[PDB]
Design a protein around this ligand. Structure first.
Ligand SMILES: CCCCCCCCCCCCCCCCCC(=O)OC[C@H](COP(=O)([O-])OCC(O)COP(=O)([O-])OC[C@@H](COC(=O)CCCCCCCCCCCCCCCCC)OC(=O)CCCCCCCCCCCCCCCCC)OC(=O)CCCCCCCCCCCCCCCCC
Ligand SMILES: CCCCCCCCCCCCCCCCCC(=O)OC[C@H](COP(=O)([O-])OCC[N+](C)(C)C)OC(=O)CCCCCCCCCCCCCCCCC
Ligand SMILES: CCCCCCCCCCCCCCCCCC(=O)OC[C@H](COP(=O)([O-])OCC[N+](C)(C)C)OC(=O)CCCCCCCCCCCCCCCCC
Ligand SMILES: CCCCCCCCCCCCCCCCCCCC(=O)O[C@H](COC(=O)CCCCCCCCCCCCCC)COP(=O)(O)OCCN
Ligand SMILES: CCCCCCCCCCCCCCCCCCCC(=O)O[C@H](COC(=O)CCCCCCCCCCCCCC)COP(=O)(O)OCCN
Ligand code: HEC
Ligand code: HEM
Ligand code: HEM
Ligand SMILES: CCCCCCCCCCCCO[C@@H]1O[C@H](CO)[C@@H](O[C@H]2O[C@H](CO)[C@@H](O)[C@H](O)[C@H]2O)[C@H](O)[C@H]1O
Ligand SMILES: CCCCCCCCCCCCO[C@@H]1O[C@H](CO)[C@@H](O[C@H]2O[C@H](CO)[C@@H](O)[C@H](O)[C@H]2O)[C@H](O)[C@H]1O
Lengths: 71, 383, 54, 244, 124, 85, 56
């Protein structure tokens, strides 16, 4: 099984917890906003890409070296 | 009489490389001239060699460069050497121009070598632009497209001239084949002008870092500057080695490893790094023609330094205010370079314009003012 | 050590011959030495290290 | 531009070939060829690589001739001028999955899978980008991303919507050397292989650079001694002035 | 610029009390930071000499002044190539920084500028 | 403006006596340690301001501009970006 | 002393030796570009089967 799966999960719960929370909160908001009607006829549709990038960037910083060490 | 003086041919060599009387106090910034000569020699040797393996036809050009990388013995080295030395050529040429501006090499009696030098600089730009197109990667094509479209700005005849340059209605095979021929030629023209500016200089002799006459204290060019030039040759070769062997693509744009595709437009079309300041100057002016004129003027304005520098003293070694102004000018030129590669977005739009204004105001306002004031301070200050 | 100067250095013909012979020796030995050094720092990585499997 | 439009920048992974004195791991290269052959070659060509290029890098002469001989290539016409096929030779280039661009796009919902011979040089990031992209398909696109039809979300790709679906899953390849074929292992191997494909001179280049660095360093040191030696009469010069 | 211009402008400043009060101290600091005295130069040694006018002025120097100028230039060149500064007696003290050349160049230029004027005279 | 050896165009020189020693008689690296430390420190100290002032100013300018640009293209900077265009 | 001269000529000679070794390497590697490239050397040793060819 893929070593990356575990390392990414560990880094999310640990050193990247703040970023994990931001992404989570973001998704909650956006999904709820999509649930509401007349969302399709809004000007601005919020995404979670920014928060996702912050999280992924963080995970990668805490994982890259560990992952390549076990391949 | 010694043969090297008696024989007319040897005596010409002698007068330039051996008995040539030089100031005894040239510092390491006088070594860029020989490094530029070394770059020119490397570019000729590697360039002529690439020409033996490169095919100028648009159907084969990109593939011929891959063939050089992959199939030709040491082709990788010759290709990377040629490509990286083009970057070093501009580092050295900017250093050489920087030295000349700081030490007032453009003042009388050296206006002519300076002015011929400004033309050498233009030929280098043209040479390097055409050479870049020859790869016929995405940046090659799109760079040629946008740079050649600047000529469309010339009123009345502009469009006709662009079609004439291209040999066609877009950048394609005819353009590529003609740029090959001219790219081969232009370095020889550049070598002739480089030789002319030296011959022009030989009437006054080299300036020196104090800006005083050296007629009182001369040194033969050889052995003293011969062996001093070796140090920078080996320092240069070390820097060359680190790029060519260990990071050959650090100075390159990845998009040039994608074959030219007239349909797909790359994300960001930027020139090679050494042309970026001129590109920033062009973007600063909103008008198309205005932008082109400004870009050319940014180079041609160097020709007025002999006039706008009003100092009674040659060069900046002893001029604290001029040294500060020069520092700001150089750093602004580097900022322009950086703004040449950012996206056309806030807040870099306004910043680019301010840097462009600072660039021109150095020649037109600040240098004439500062040089006038320092004249007065030296006179009153020493009474 | 005067002897060494007199034999190898005094005549430029001899000095240039010495330099070129030394360059020959250097070139051959340096080649061999770097080859071995390169193989030790890149041990088990190169084709010659895995070739034996095939 | 927005970060989305740029793509997330890939992590710096410690590749075996990173390091001034480091070659590729050829065992990884060989494994990576097997990933190319069993996964990527379905859609992506490797047109600049000939069978002969694998020899003495990843495979012996015999293995590579075997690979070449399994395929049919266009021969010179026969004596009646009819087209003929021949078995492949080491000089032949590895053949592509599609005869032209149009066929490639038709098979990939309009997207054209690029040739991979240069892709490691042709993208910012190189090996790291290829590794990040192959391994970086999230289970679910970040909430609020609208993918165009036939696009897949991948943050490393600029814009986020990539026409290539996730293709590496645990055990799509069975490595012949017994290495566990995990998504990450396969991505590392194929990314190494593609890096080699883009720059096959890499190993030789770095060795010659080591020789150059050493010689040029010594020459630089000596040139400094010699300069100082020859200049000492000028540096050491002394004056006595008696006004006349 | 001409030495004439520099000298005239400086005299306008030294006349105006206000101007001199603010300019003289600045110019003295400027000259201290300029640092030419640290190479044993006098100010006048630094004036560009490759001009017909300045060559003429240098030819008009008294032999003594001329020989000493050559020494200061040679000495400074040696400090420059050595990357050393003058020490002790080689440093130019403010009292030794005399305008030995300014009178000669002002005379040369006076004649050259009169010549230009008179080449443009119109009988009335 | 410059002649050649023997007629270089120097004003007449008289009364400067110049002394030097053979390269073989001198230690080429005499006082190198002192120079490499004290002389280089002196020369660098005297030129430091002329480099530091412009570099620090233009680096600060670039830093401010790049940080603003980055911020304008976030969610948070949407409104300020809309006005800036 | 002869020791004294010899030492400085050892430095000059070493520099000449590395310059010679470096030049030889540079010349040899660089000119080799003009020897048959890899693709030419491949389109060279033609292999033919013999099973296909009948007697006579
Ligand atoms: C590219 C290709 C590679 C080849 C290398 C060639 C580069 C060599 C060159 O021209 O520069 C070396 C050059 C050494 O030349 P030099 O002949 O010893 O003195 C030249 C200066 O005029 C002498 O200037 P100085 O005597 O006033 O010394 C100034 C220098 C100190 O110079 C030192 O070398 C120490 O220190 C600085 O200016 C540093 C600024 C402070 C930063 C903190 O380095 C500098 O002085 C660079 C200062 C530029 C700012
Ligand atoms: C970056 C900012 C550089 C500002 C330089 C200010 C002077 C300084 O400290 O430099 C050290 C030295 C100071 O040398 P110096 O000759 O003035 O003083 C030597 C020592 N004294 C004063 C005692 C005689 O300056 C140089 O050597 C300047 C060379 C300029 C090269 C510029 C290249 C830039 C490319 C732009 C092209 C258009
Ligand atoms: C690049 C080419 C390098 C060629 C090296 C062959 C020997 C020449 C050399 O290094 O210089 C020694 C010789 C002489 O160096 P030299 O001038 O120090 O030797 C003369 C004094 N004796 C003979 C007493 C030592 O250089 C030349 O003759 C010119 C060739 C330059 C290289
Ligand atoms: C790269 C190429 C560098 C390798 C060659 C350097 C010389 C090799 C050592 C030989 C040596 O030192 O002897 C001198 C030869 O140098 C010479 O005669 C040449 C001196 C320096 C070599 C090159 C000069 C560079 C100056 C300009 C650079 C141009 C770059 C543009 C392409 C002669 O010693 P001696 O002649 O002092 O007398 C002393 C009595 N015989
Ligand atoms: C043209 C561009 C000039 C730049 C030169 C840099 C190195 C190019 C040579 C290739 C190389 O990497 O040589 C290495 C050794 O380094 C070296 O020894 C070369 C570094 C020496 C640099 C300066 C010496 C001469 C350069 C130009 C002089 C021109 C005169 C004649 C060509 C490898 O060694 P190898 O194993 O590949 O070598 C074969 C013999 N064993
Ligand atoms: C069945 C289809 C398919 C398979 C299997 C496939 N790809 Fe792709 N790939 C594509 C398509 C289509 C694109 C173009 C995506 C686009 O431009 O939107 C692509 C794009 C890429 C890109 C470049 C993305 C970019 O930046 O332009 C790389 C690198 C890549 N693939 C590598 C691989 C590797 C490595 C494998 C497998 C080990 C692989 N691909 C498997 C279809 C495939
Ligand atoms: C191929 C490009 C060039 C080469 C090979 C070259 C070469 C040289 C050489 C060998 C010297 C004498 C030594 C030195 O001062 O460094 C020199 C001096 C000079 N060059 Fe260049 N040069 C080139 C380009 C330029 C350019 C672009 C300019 C000006 C814009 C220029 C202006 C000068 C001036 C003014 C001098 C006299 C400087 C002085 O000694 O005070 N040159 N050049
Ligand atoms: C001042 C001298 C020269 C400069 C500044 C110069 C610059 C360049 C540049 C920038 C490129 C693009 C390189 C790349 O990214 O691949 C190039 C390519 C090329 N140049 Fe030159 N060049 C010079 C002299 C020459 C000469 C004399 C020739 C003789 C034909 C030549 C032949 C080529 C060829 C064939 C290419 C295309 C192959 C390639 O891209 O490597 N060059 N040149
Ligand atoms: C830098 C590359 C090396 C090759 C040299 C360049 C080739 C082209 C040079 C010839 C151009 C004319 O160059 C000119 O030649 C003559 C004699 O050679 C020189 O004349 C100079 O030296 C000779 C003796 O050495 C004297 O008779 C004369 O009084 C003096 O001025 C000029 O100062 C130089 O300007
Ligand atoms: C002014 C010129 C005077 C006439 C001189 C003629 C020189 C022409 C020489 C070309 C000879 C090249 O021939 C060949 O050189 C290469 C390097 O280039 C050597 O190659 C050796 O080192 C290279 C790296 O340098 C490796 O890639 C290679 O695996 C190894 O075998 C070969 O062992 C030799 O067979």
């Amino acid at each position: 099984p893929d070593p990356a799966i575990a390392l990414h999960e560990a880094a999310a719960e640990g050193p990247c917890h703040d970023f994990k929370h931001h992404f989570d909160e973001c998704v909650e908001r956006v999904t709820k906003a999509q649930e509401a009607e007349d969302y399709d006829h809004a000007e601005y549709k919020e995404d979670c890409v920014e928060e996702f990038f912050h999280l992924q960037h963080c995970i990668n910083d805490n994982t890259a070296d560990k992952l390549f060490r076990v391949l | 009489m010694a043969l090297r003086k008696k024989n007319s041919l040897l005596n010409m060599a002698n007068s330039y490389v051996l008995d040539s009387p030089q100031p005894s106090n040239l510092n390491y910034f006088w070594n860029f001239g020989s490094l530029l000569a070394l770059c020119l020699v490397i570019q000729l040797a590697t360039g002529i060699t690439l020409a033996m393996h490169y095919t100028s036809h648009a159907s084969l050009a990109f593939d011929s460069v891959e063939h050089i990388m992959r199939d030709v013995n040491f082709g990788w080295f010759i290709r990377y050497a040629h490509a990286n030395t083009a970057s070093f050529f501009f580092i050295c040429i900017y250093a050489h121009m920087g030295r000349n501006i700081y030490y007032g090499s453009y003042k009388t009696p050296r206006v002519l070598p300076w002015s011929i030098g400004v033309i050498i600089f233009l030929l280098l730009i043209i040479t390097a632009f055409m050479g870049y197109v020859l790869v016929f990667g995405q940046m090659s094509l799109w760079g040629a497209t946008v740079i050649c479209n600047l000529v469309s700005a010339i009123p009345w005849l502009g469009e006709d001239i662009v079609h004439f340059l291209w040999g066609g209605f877009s950048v394609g095979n005819p353009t590529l084949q003609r740029f090959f021929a001219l790219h081969y030629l232009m370095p020889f023209v550049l070598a002739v002008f480089a030789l002319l500016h030296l011959i022009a200089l030989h009437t006054a002799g080299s300036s020196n870092p104090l800006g005083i006459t050296s007629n009182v204290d001369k040194l033969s060019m050889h052995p003293y500057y011969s062996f001093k030039d070796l140090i920078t040759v080996f320092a240069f070769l070390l820097m060359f080695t680190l790029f060519v062997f260990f990071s050959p693509d650090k100075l390159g744009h990845p998009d040039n490893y994608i074959p030219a595709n007239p349909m797909v437009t790359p994300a960001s079309i930027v020139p090679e790094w050494y042309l970026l300041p001129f590109y920033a100057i062009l973007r600063a002016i909103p008008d198309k023609l205005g932008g082109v004129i400004a870009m050319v003027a940014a180079i041609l304005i160097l020709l007025i330094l002999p006039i706008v520098d009003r100092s009674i003293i040659r060069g900046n070694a002893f001029k604290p205010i001029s040294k500060l102004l020069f520092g700001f000018f150089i750093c602004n030129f580097l900022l322009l370079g950086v703004l040449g590669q950012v996206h056309i977005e806030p807040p870099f739009i306004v910043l680019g314009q301010i840097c462009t204004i600072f660039y021109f105001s150095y020649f037109l306002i600040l240098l004439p003012m500062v040089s006038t004031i320092e004249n007065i301070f030296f006179y009153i200050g020493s009474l | 050590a005067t002897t060494f100067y007199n034999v190898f250095v005094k005549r430029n013909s001899a000095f240039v011959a010495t330099i070129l012979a030394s360059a020959f020796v250097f070139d051959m030995t340096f080649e061999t030495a770097i080859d071995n050094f390169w193989d030790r720092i890149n041990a088990g990585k190169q084709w010659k290290d895995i070739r034996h499997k095939y | 531009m927005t970060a989305a439009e740029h793509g997330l920048h890939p992590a710096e992974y410690p590749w075996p070939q990173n390091g001034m004195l480091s070659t590729f791991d050829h065992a990884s290269l060989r494994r990576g060829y097997q990933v190319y052959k069993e996964v990527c070659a379905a859609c992506h060509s490797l047109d600049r690589i000939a069978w002969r290029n694998l020899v003495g890098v990843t495979h012996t002469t015999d293995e590579a001739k075997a690979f070449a001989e399994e395929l049919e290539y266009d021969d010179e016409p026969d004596d009646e001028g009819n087209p003929r096929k021949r078995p492949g030779k080491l000089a032949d280039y590895i053949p592509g999955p599609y005869p032209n661009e149009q066929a490639a796009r038709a098979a990939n919902q309009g997207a054209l899978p690029p040739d991979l011979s240069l892709i490691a040089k042709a993208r910012h990031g190189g090996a790291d980008y290829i590794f990040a992209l192959l391994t970086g398909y999230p289970d679910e696109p970040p909430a609020g991303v609208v993918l165009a039809p036939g696009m897949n979300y991948n943050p490393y790709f600029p814009g986020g919507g990539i026409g290539m679906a996730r293709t590496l899953f645990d055990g799509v390849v069975e490595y012949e050397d017994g290495t566990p074929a995990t998504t990450s292992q396969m991505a590392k191997d194929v990314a190494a292989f593609l890096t080699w494909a883009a720059e096959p001179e890499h190993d030789e280049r770095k060795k010659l650079g080591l020789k150059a660095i050493i010689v040029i360093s010594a020459m630089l040191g000596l040139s400094v001694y010699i300069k100082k030696f020859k200049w000492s009469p000028i540096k050491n010069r002394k004056f006595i002035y008696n006004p006349p | 610029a001409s030495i004439t211009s520099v000298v005239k402008t400086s005299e306008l400043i030294l006349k105006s009390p206000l101007l001199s009060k603010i300019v003289v101290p600045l110019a003295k600091t400027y000259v201290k930071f300029s640092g030419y005295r640290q190479l044993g130069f006098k100010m006048n040694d630094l004036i560009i000499e490759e001009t017909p006018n300045m060559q003429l002025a240098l030819r008009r120097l008294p032999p003594t002044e001329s020989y000493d100028r050559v020494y200061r230039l040679i000495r400074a060149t040696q400090f420059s190539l050595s990357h050393k500064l003058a020490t002790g007696n080689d440093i130019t003290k403010p009292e030794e920084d005399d305008h030995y050349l300014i009178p000669y160049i002002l005379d040369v230029e006076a004649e050259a500028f009169e010549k230009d004027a008179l080449d443009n005279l119109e009988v009335v | 403006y410059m002649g050649w050896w023997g007629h270089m165009g120097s004003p007449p020189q008289k009364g400067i006596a110049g002394y030097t020693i053979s390269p073989f008689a001198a230690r080429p690296f005499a006082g190198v340690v002192h120079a490499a430390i004290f002389n280089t420190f002196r020369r660098t100290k005297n030129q430091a301001l002329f480099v530091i002032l412009p570099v620090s100013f233009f680096y600060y300018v670039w830093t401010q501009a790049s940080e603003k640009n980055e911020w304008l293209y976030t969610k948070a900077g949407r409104h300020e970006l809309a006005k800036a265009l | 002393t002869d020791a004294n001269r010899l030492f400085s000529y050892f430095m000059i000679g070493s520099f000449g030796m590395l310059s010679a070794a470096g030049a030889k390497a540079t010349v040899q590697d660089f000119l080799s570009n003009m020897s048959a490239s890899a693709d030419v050397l491949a389109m060279a040793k033609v292999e033919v089967k013999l099973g296909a060819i009948p007697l006579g």
